[PDB]
Ligand binder design. Structure first.
Ligand code: HHT
Ligand code: ZN
Length: 138
């Protein structure tokens, strides 16, 4: 689990969105596994506006922050999962790293702030759903 709080926005994994994220839906993209919902409180996270391909992500299944090289946001295939069918995820950044069910929502961050969150895992790979293109969060 885990979420981004910038301005009046909560960003989550779509597949982990609560009944309240949907009651207050701002934007969802099934293909990217993202949902943004509205908040009452203001958020203190900076969103990274950069083309960084190195940063740190938190891995709840190790209670550890891992530094990673990750791919440019792309249209990369994700297989089964109890949450989705066989489908290409867009704005997806893979890195070599540990990602289990429950590691989704873990924040990847560079010097410029939040690059995105964990959305995919397996095969020794960790998919982060990118949020740097979502300028409207600022
Ligand atoms: C990174 O999370 C996963 C890793 C694997 Br392998 C399968 C499914 C998920 C999604 C989840 O359970 O949130
Ligand atoms: Zn950066």
């Amino acid at each position: 689990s885990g979420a981004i709080y910038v301005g009046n926005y909560r960003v989550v994994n779509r597949h982990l969105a609560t009944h309240n994220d949907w009651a207050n839906l701002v934007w969802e993209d099934s293909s990217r596994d993202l949902l943004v919902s509205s908040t009452t409180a203001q958020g203190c996270d900076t969103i990274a506006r950069c083309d960084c391909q190195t940063g740190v992500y938190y891995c709840s299944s190790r209670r550890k922050h891992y530094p990673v090289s990750f791919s440019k946001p792309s249209l990369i295939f994700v297989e089964a999962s109890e949450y989705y069918p066989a489908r290409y995820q867009s704005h997806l950044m893979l890195a070599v790293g540990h990602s289990e069910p429950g590691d989704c929502g873990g924040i990847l961050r560079c010097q410029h702030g939040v690059v995105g969150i964990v959305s995919t895992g397996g095969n020794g790979l960790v998919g982060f759903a990118d949020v740097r293109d979502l300028l409207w969060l600022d």
